[PDB]
Amino acid sequence: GYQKDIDKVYKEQNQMNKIASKVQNTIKTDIKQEDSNTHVYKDGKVIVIGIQLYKDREKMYYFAYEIKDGKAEINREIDPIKYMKDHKADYEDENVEVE
Amino acid sequence: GYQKDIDKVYKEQNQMNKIASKVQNTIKTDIKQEDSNTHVYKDGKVIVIGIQLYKDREKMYYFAYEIKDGKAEINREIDPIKYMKDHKADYEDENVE
Name the CATH code of domain B1-97 (choices 3.90.226.10, 3.10.450.560, 3.10.150.10, 3.30.70.380). Answer: 3.10.450.560
Q: How far apart are CA A33 and CA A51, in angstroms?
A: 8
Q: How far apart are CA B36 and CA B97, in angstroms?
A: 10
Question: B43-81 in b/e burial notation, b at 16+ Cβ within 10 A?
Answer: eeebbbbbbbbeeeeeeeebbbbebeeeebebeeebebe
Burial of A69 (0-12, 13-18, 19+ CB in 10 A): exposed
Q: How far apart are CA A37 and CA A89, in angstroms?
A: 12
CA angle A39, A45, A46 (to 5 degrees): 40
Residue type, B48: V
Class of the CATH-defined domain A1-99: alpha beta
Query: Is A24 close to B19, i.e. CB distance below 8 A?
Result: no
State the nearest Cα–Cα gap between B19 and chain A, in angstroms: 6
Q: How far apart are CA A10 and CA A2, in angstroms?
A: 13
Which has the closest alpha carbon to A63: A17, A3, A18?
A: A17
Chain B environment of A13 (Cβ under 8 Å): 23
> B21 to chain A: nearest residue by CA?
A20
Chain A positions touching chain B (beta carbons under 8 Å): 13, 16-17, 19-20, 22-25, 27, 53, 63, 74, 76
Query: Is B24 close to A74, i.e. CB distance below 8 A?
Result: no
